[PDB]
């Protein structure tokens, strides 16, 4: 009664090798599931995090290398363009021989970098306004500094786009880093040294004098400016109510309630919008509707932006771009980032060039590279099997609603509408395989020179930003996939109410028509549940079946929802993480993900119970004295075998909306009565707390 296929053997070995059978399952299921893997693996010098999930991403990269590095007769123009981009990217001896010159040529188009220009005021002062400086970085290069302006889907009207105004991102990973004490100190030091070093390299190249004390003073000014911007931005916890974030206005209204004075100007929102929007032949009047995500921030900016000169601001604005571009230049410029990378990620070296190149071209040519990938790696048959899993799990979710005693009947019915309404996307869009010419047309405006990597990425910057801006007066495309196919991940989009499962994720350990179904439900099954559940988390529940941000909850049901979910805030907020210096997770920032992990697990396990009930028990696995209910949980846990560099734990605990893997595994299993039964856990054993959190 034992499976002895080749596939069963591979499943078995992997499970056996990862686990540590000498830990007790009810003490620490993560150790039990992953202890073997932990004992045996070291984090590569180039990874900030390592583990089964990252290995999957590393192996996907290998496939990409194989499909990009070799020209073939039969290659369509779209594919040709992608391989050309790749070749430009991996030719380091061409890149190296150009030193910093490509960047130098670019510098005047952004109003220079004051610290590395002499007589900056003389050269740029008369013609410099915030409106145009900021606009330039935004419209031409996709770089958002100080004020973030973008075109995106209207939250309250999902068939349309609108302009958005939000707070910008920071050079360091989060606002927390800007306190610059304790765990953040080295990052602040590296950050300022990084600026110093780049300005010193550019000064050496242009043949200009170098006063070291001037560099220190000017760059620390940059940090002091960015420290004040960091302080002005809203915490992620004060941004997670999508209802309270959305503030539709007019540029008219915005000029009153949110005035600024920069270099004693003062600022013109209307000038600013047309500077950006003119980049694609669309002009704007005070009529225009504008969604404002950071009203408090704009207010907090007024007293700050009056204190700094054009030279002070341009120093930061430029640095924030330059920062991004430095790895794209010569070896000399590449080194300047070393300490900065180490302080944020813990990595002592950059990842292989071919790897960064594969990721770069994937990210800029997702349909072309997705096509190459799926032809090389993805079954295609898998698609129907996964389709049926989604139906089973969509089903379960709907049924679970009727056992929700805390939700009223009208809210129950409206939840069911959205569930039936969820659109799924599996593997890849067929277009990319079956319609060569359409794929060719997508990349029509792109022309890459093979020995001009930098010009290539600059061209890529403009093309992306142009595509995005030109959408303002356009209706949201329905058939558009929110991810390329060569991705090891999955997605839910509230704005389309759709779930996405790329080819990249439809492989072991998540999925294989050739692995036990206990593994399949435990893996991709859980992920399906996780993504359906996103439709209904602290964020998704605010969005209806059509992706529009409308309240469809009765006071009571919503209010009860918040009670149930308060449990998980406290559960996860009380996990504390050794790797991150004993800091505790943010139970609010990670709430949505934690809700989705917990929901997903229940649905996937109930679907597997349904499957056993409809089909009977599956053949056992050789070497493993576990039944299939236990195997479901094992595989489920081993998705997250892995570990973090302390540097990157410090980072991710402030920036990741997911809890760290160990804690996702602990948190979900602790809340699962079903887990403790499968594993026969003593009450109040660590894996089996008395209080259990439940929402879906």
Ligand X SMILES: O=C(O)CCC(=O)N[C@@H](CC(=O)O)Cc1ccc(-c2cccc(Cl)c2)cc1
Interface with ligand X (CB under 6 A), residue from 531, 537, 538, 548 = 531
Q: How far is the CB of 621 from ligand X (least distance, A)?
A: 19
Q: Is 384 annotated as a binding residue?
A: no
Q: What is the dihedral of CA 165, 171, 174, 179, to 10 degrees?
A: -120
CB 41, CB 339: distance < 8 Å: no
Q: How far is the CB of 283 from ligand NAG (least distance, A)?
A: 8
Specify the residue, 274 or 494, whose C-beta has the smaller distance to ligand X.
494
> Contact between 596 and Zn ion (CB under 5 A)?
yes
> Contact between 94 and ligand NAG (CB under 6 A)?
yes
Active-site entry in 28, 288, 531, 537: 531
> Contact between 601 and Zn ion (CB under 5 A)?
no
Q: Is 593 annotated as a binding residue?
A: yes
Specify the residue, 156 or 694, whose C-beta has the smaller distance to ligand X.
694
Between CA 545 and CA 559 the distance in angstroms is 21
- Collapse the DSSP code of 141 into the 3-class scheme (helix H, G, I; strand E, B; otherwise coil) and give the result: helix
Buried b (16+ CB within 10 A) or exposed e, 368-395: bbbbbbbeebbeeebbebbeebbebbbe
Q: Please compute, for residue 459, the number of CA atoms within 13 A of its CA located in the half-sphere on the CB side.
A: 15
Q: Give, as ranges, the residues between 616 and 645 that touch ligand X (CB under 6 A).
A: 636, 639-640
Pair of tokens at residue 217: 């003073």
Active-site entry in 275, 366, 442, 597: 597
> Contact between 489 and ligand X (CB under 6 A)?
yes
Return the range that interacts with ligand NAG (CB under 6 A); candidates 87-95, 366-374, 602-610, 626-634: 87-95
Selection from Zn ion, ligand X, ligand NAG, none that 597 binds (CB < 5 to 8 A by kind) is: ligand X
Return the range that interacts with ligand NAG (CB under 6 A); candidates 270-278, 378-386, 517-525, 595-603: 270-278
Interface with ligand NAG (CB under 6 A), residue from 312, 451, 455, 674 = 451
Between CA 452 and CA 449 the distance in angstroms is 5
Q: Is 551 annotated in the active site?
A: no
CB 621, CB 6: distance < 8 Å: no
Specify the residue, 506 or 527, whose C-beta has the smaller distance to ligand X.
527
Q: Is 682 annotated as a binding residue?
A: no
Q: How far is the CB of 545 from ligand X (least distance, A)?
A: 19
Pair of tokens at residue 36: 């073997």
Between CA 29 and CA 669 the distance in angstroms is 8
Return the range that interacts with ligand X (CB under 6 A); candidates 159-167, 328-336, 403-411, 527-535: 527-535
> Contact between 139 and ligand NAG (CB under 6 A)?
no
Q: How far is the CB of 347 from ligand X (least distance, A)?
A: 16
Q: How far is the CB of 664 from ligand X (least distance, A)?
A: 4
Q: Is 538 annotated in the active site?
A: no
Strand partners, 493: 498
CB 486, CB 60: distance < 8 Å: yes
Q: Alpha carbon of 551 to those of 293, 541, 545: distances in Å?
A: 19, 8, 11
What are φ and ψ of residue 422, in 5° steps?
-60, 120
CB 411, CB 553: distance < 8 Å: yes
Q: Which long-range contacts (CB under 8 A, 24 or more apart) does 582-587 make?
A: 583/183, 583/650, 583/653, 585/653, 585/659, 585/660, 585/663, 586/236, 586/237, 586/653, 586/654
> Contact between 527 and Zn ion (CB under 5 A)?
no
Between CA 531 and CA 528 the distance in angstroms is 5
Pair of tokens at residue 618: 């599956």
Interface with ligand X (CB under 6 A), residue from 328, 367, 392, 668 = 668
Q: How far is the CB of 579 from ligand X (least distance, A)?
A: 15
Selection from Zn ion, ligand NAG, ligand X, none that 275 binds (CB < 5 to 8 A by kind) is: ligand NAG
Selection from ligand NAG, ligand X, Zn ion, none that 226 binds (CB < 5 to 8 A by kind) is: none
Between CA 559 and CA 156 the distance in angstroms is 22
Q: Give, as ranges, the residues between 584 and 613 that touch ligand X (CB under 6 A).
A: 593, 597
Cβ neighbors of 45 (< 8 A, separation 6 or more) are 347, 348, 349
> Contact between 129 and ligand NAG (CB under 6 A)?
yes
Q: Applying CB under 6 A, which residues contact ligand NAG?
A: 87, 91, 93-94, 129, 131, 228, 231, 271, 274-275, 278, 300, 451, 570, 573-574, 584, 587
Q: Applying CB under 6 A, which residues contact ligand X?
A: 53, 489-490, 526-527, 530-531, 593, 597, 636, 639-640, 658, 664-665, 668
Binding positions for a peptide are 49
Give me the active site residues, please.
531, 597
Q: Applying CB under 5 A, which residues contact Zn ion?
A: 593, 596
């Amino acid at each position: 009664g034992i499976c002895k296929s080749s596939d069963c053997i591979k499943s078995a070995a992997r499970l056996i090798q990862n686990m540590d059978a000498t830990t007790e399952p009810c003490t620490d299921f993560f150790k039990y599931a992953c202890g073997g893997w932990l004992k045996r693996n070291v984090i590569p010098e180039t990874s900030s995090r390592y583990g089964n999930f990252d290995i999957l991403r590393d192996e996907l990269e290998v496939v990409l290398k194989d499909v990009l590095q070799e020209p073939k007769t039969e290659d369509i123009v779209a594919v040709q363009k992608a391989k050309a981009l790749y070749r430009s990217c991996i030719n380091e001896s061409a890149i190296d021989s150009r030193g910093g010159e490509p960047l130098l040529k670019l510098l005047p188009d952004i109003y220079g970098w004051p610290v590395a220009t002499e007589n900056w005021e003389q050269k740029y002062g008369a013609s410099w306004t915030a409106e145009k400086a900021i606009a330039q970085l935004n419209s031409k290069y996709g770089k958002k500094v100080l004020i973030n302006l973008f075109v995106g889907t209207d939250d309250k009207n999902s068939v349309n786009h609108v302009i958005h105004i939000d707070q910008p991102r920071l050079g360091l990973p989060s606002r927390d880093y800007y306190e610059c004490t304790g765990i953040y100190k080295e990052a602040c030091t590296a950050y300022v040294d990084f600026m110093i070093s780049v300005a010193r390299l550019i000064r050496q190249e242009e043949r200009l004098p170098i006063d070291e004390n001037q560099l220190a003073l000017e760059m620390n000014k940059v940090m002091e400016l960015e420290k004040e911007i960091a302080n002005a931005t809203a915490k992620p916890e004060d941004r997670n109510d999508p209802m309270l974030l959305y503030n539709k206005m007019t540029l008219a209204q915005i000029q009153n309630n949110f005035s600024l004075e920069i270099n004693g100007k003062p600022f013109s929102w209307l000038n600013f919008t047309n500077e950006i929007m003119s980049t694609v032949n669309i002009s704007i009047t005070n009529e225009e509707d504008v969604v404002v995500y950071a009203p408090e921030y704009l207010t907090k900016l007024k007293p700050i932006l009056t204190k700094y000169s054009a030279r002070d601001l341009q120093n930061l604005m430029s640095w924030r771009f330059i920062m991004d571009l430095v790895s794209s230049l010569s070896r000399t410029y590449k080194e300047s980032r070393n300490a900065f990378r180490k302080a944020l990620y813990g990595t002592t070296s950059e990842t292989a060039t071919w790897r960064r190149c594969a990721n770069y071209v994937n990210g800029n040519m997702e349909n072309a590279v997705g096509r190459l990938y799926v032809e090389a790696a993805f079954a295609g048959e898998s698609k129907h099997v996964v389709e049926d899993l989604i139906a089973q799990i969509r089903e379960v979710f709907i049924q679970t609603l009727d056992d929700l005693t805390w939700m009223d009947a009208e809210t129950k019915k409206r939840a069911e509408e959205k569930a039936l309404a969820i659109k799924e996307r599996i593997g890849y869009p067929d277009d990319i395989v079956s319609n060569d010419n359409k794929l060719n047309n997508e990349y029509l405006e792109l022309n890459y020179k093979e020995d001009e990597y930098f010009e290539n990425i600059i061209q890529n910057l403009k093309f992306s930003q142009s595509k995005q801006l030109k959408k303002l007066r356009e209706k949201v495309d329905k058939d558009e996939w929110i991810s390329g196919a060569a991705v090891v991940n999955a997605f839910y989009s509230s704005g389309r109410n759709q779930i996405v499962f790329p080819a990249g994720i439809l492989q072991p350990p998540f999925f294989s028509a050739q692995q036990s179904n206990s593994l399949n439900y435990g893996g991709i099954g859980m992920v399906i549940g996780h993504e359906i559940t996103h439709g209904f988390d602290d964020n998704g529940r605010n969005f209806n079946k059509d992706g529009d941000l409308v309240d469809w909850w009765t006071q009571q049901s919503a209010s009860n929802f918040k009670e149930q979910s308060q449990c998980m805030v406290y559960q996860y907020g009380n996990f504390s993480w050794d790797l991150a210096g004993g800091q505790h997770l943010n139970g609010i920032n990670t709430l949505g993900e934690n809700i989705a992990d917990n929901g997903g697990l229940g649905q996937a396990y109930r679907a597997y119970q349904n499957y056993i009930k409809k089909n009977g028990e599956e053949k056992l696995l050789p070497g493993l004295d576990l039944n299939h209910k236990q195997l479901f949980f094992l595989n489920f846990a081993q998705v997250w075998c892995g570990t973090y560099r302390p540097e990157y734990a410090v980072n991710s605990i402030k920036t990741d909306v997911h809890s760290p893997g160990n804690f996702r595994i602990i948190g979900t299993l602790q809340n699962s009565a079903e887990f403790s039964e499968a594993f026969h856990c003593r009450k109040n054993s660590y894996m089996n707390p008395e209080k259990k959190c439940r929402v879906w």
